[PDB]
Design a protein around this ligand. Structure first.
Ligand SMILES: CCn1c(CO)nn(-c2cc3c(cc2F)c(=O)c(-c2ccccc2C)cn3C(C)C)c1=O
Ligand SMILES: Cc1cc2nc3c(=O)[nH]c(=O)nc-3n(C[C@H](O)[C@H](O)[C@H](O)COP(=O)(O)O)c2cc1C
Ligand SMILES: O=C(O)c1cc(=O)[nH]c(=O)[nH]1
Ligand SMILES: [Cl-]
Ligand SMILES: [Cl-]
Ligand SMILES: [Cl-]
Ligand SMILES: [Cl-]
Ligand SMILES: [Cl-]
Ligand SMILES: [Cl-]
Ligand SMILES: [Cl-]
Ligand SMILES: [Cl-]
Ligand SMILES: [Cl-]
Ligand SMILES: [Cl-]
Length: 366
């Protein structure tokens, strides 16, 4: 453990979180990050951590999950933190305010957060112009193994969900290495119903037709991000649709509307999605089941409760090609990224893996 990891986790982050309301802490973090006001990322990515998936090289398999940088304000600062890839969003077609404040709640006794932001978004036009200002910088970053994902949502009052996603593909698809069809926010009424078989097949057919209409150098991979709260039937249906349509990958998982037994935080009964440690094993077991249902043929980005190399490797061995985190960054701060990478490299060597690639899905081969 570095001096920075201990100082951030034991002193700086608890002190700052104690002075700030949770949404104010989020906003200040985006500003720090966008200005590059960050501790040194001392960790040097090794060849062991490189992954080739989704038509790209990833210098390391640890990404920032959607929700931290909803509006594409802090992309370059997130690469400076040492993330191997960045996902922005969710972005909605029109700007919208989201839910009334307060709408984010800290459960420090559980190393968890509950949020009900409700897709607060600057909207596609603002984000498009923001990404266009750095489009060639991103092309060089992607060529250097640092890809960009864009996560698409839908407006609260939209009457045609598929048209909202189609608009996102047309506007931000040409600026993305991958797009995410987010059908799993717990905080937009009716959205998770889009995970059902008939609704998902119709929606994803339209999204893929729009993506296929983009010029080759502007044609991203398309992933579907799913909930941790699906029935067995829902998961079988999603696997069937993904294989039928040739969806490029899955992001597994969004936050949970469940409240696992044992939560201690005073705010455990707030409405919204739960993230962090209580989600971890529910997410890992969703990865495991989606990998099996897709015969290991569909790349998975694993997300939910990653705060250590062990957490990352458990998702990789369950079937994830890449992992993301967000909630751990709220407790540990920026040094968590190098921590996870250093611990993951050490565990791969301890378990006899030549690299990340060799470990993907390894549990299924035991
Ligand atoms: C879920 C909403 N939510 C919360 C509340 O639940 N916190 N949070 C957050 C706060 C963060 C950070 C990262 C975060 F995800 C971070 O990385 C830093 C920080 C420290 C030193 C230097 C450079 C940086 C960027 C500072 N802060 C705050 C304390 C100001 C965040 O998104
Ligand atoms: C404050 C907050 C906002 C989020 N907003 C989004 C979002 O806009 N789109 C999305 O696909 N996921 C969103 N998520 C979910 C995360 O991307 C991630 O799937 C989930 O938090 C689990 O990872 P974690 O336990 O590492 O935080 C959000 C999560 C948090 C904590
Ligand atoms: O904006 C939100 O409320 C939100 C979206 C999402 O996909 N996941 C989440 O936890 N919150
Ligand atoms: Cl960088
Ligand atoms: Cl709080
Ligand atoms: Cl806009
Ligand atoms: Cl373009
Ligand atoms: Cl296609
Ligand atoms: Cl592309
Ligand atoms: Cl079930
Ligand atoms: Cl529950
Ligand atoms: Cl809820
Ligand atoms: Cl392990």
């Amino acid at each position: 453990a570095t001096g920075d990891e201990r100082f951030y986790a034991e002193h700086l982050m608890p002190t700052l979180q104690g002075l700030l309301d949770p949404e104010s802490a989020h906003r200040l973090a985006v500003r720090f990050t966008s200005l590059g006001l960050l501790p040194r990322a001392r960790f040097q990515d090794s060849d062991m951590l490189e992954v080739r998936v989704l038509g790209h090289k990833f210098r390391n398999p640890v990404g920032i999950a959607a929700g931290f940088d909803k509006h594409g304000e802090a992309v370059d600062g997130l690469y400076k933190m040492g993330f191997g890839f960045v996902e922005i969003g969710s972005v909605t077609p029109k700007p919208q305010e989201g839910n009334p404040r307060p709408r984010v709640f800290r459960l420090p006794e559980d190393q968890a957060v509950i949020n009900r932001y409700g897709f607060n978004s600057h909207g596609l036009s603002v984000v498009e112009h923001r990404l266009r200002a750095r489009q060639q910088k991103q092309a060089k970053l992607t060529e250097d193994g640092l890809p960009l994902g864009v996560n698409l949502g839908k407006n609260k009052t939209s009457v045609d969900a598929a048209e909202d996603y189609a608009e996102g593909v047309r506007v931000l698809g040409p600026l993305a290495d991958y797009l995410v069809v987010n059908v799993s926010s717990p905080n937009t009424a009716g959205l998770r119903s889009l995970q059902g078989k008939a609704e998902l097949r119709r929606l994803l057919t339209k999204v893929l037709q729009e993506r296929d209409g983009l010029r080759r150098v502007h044609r991203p991979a398309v992933l579907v991000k799913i909930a941790p709260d699906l029935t067995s039937q829902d998961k079988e249906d999603i696997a069937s649709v993904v294989k039928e349509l040739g969806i490029d990958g899955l992001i597994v998982t969004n936050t949970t509307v469940s409240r696992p037994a044992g939560l201690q935080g005073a705010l455990r009964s707030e409405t919204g999605g739960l993230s962090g440690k209580p989600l971890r094993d529910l997410s890992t077991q969703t990865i495991r089941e989606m990998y099996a249902l897709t015969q290991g043929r569909v790349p998975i980005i694993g997300v939910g409760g990653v705060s250590s190399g062990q957490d990352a490797l458990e998702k990789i061995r369950a079937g994830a090609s890449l992992v993301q985190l967000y909630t751990a960054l709220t407790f540990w701060g920026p040094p968590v990224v190098g921590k996870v990478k250093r611990e993951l490299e050490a565990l791969l060597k301890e378990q006899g893996f030549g690299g990340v690639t060799d470990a993907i899905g390894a549990d299924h081969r035991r």
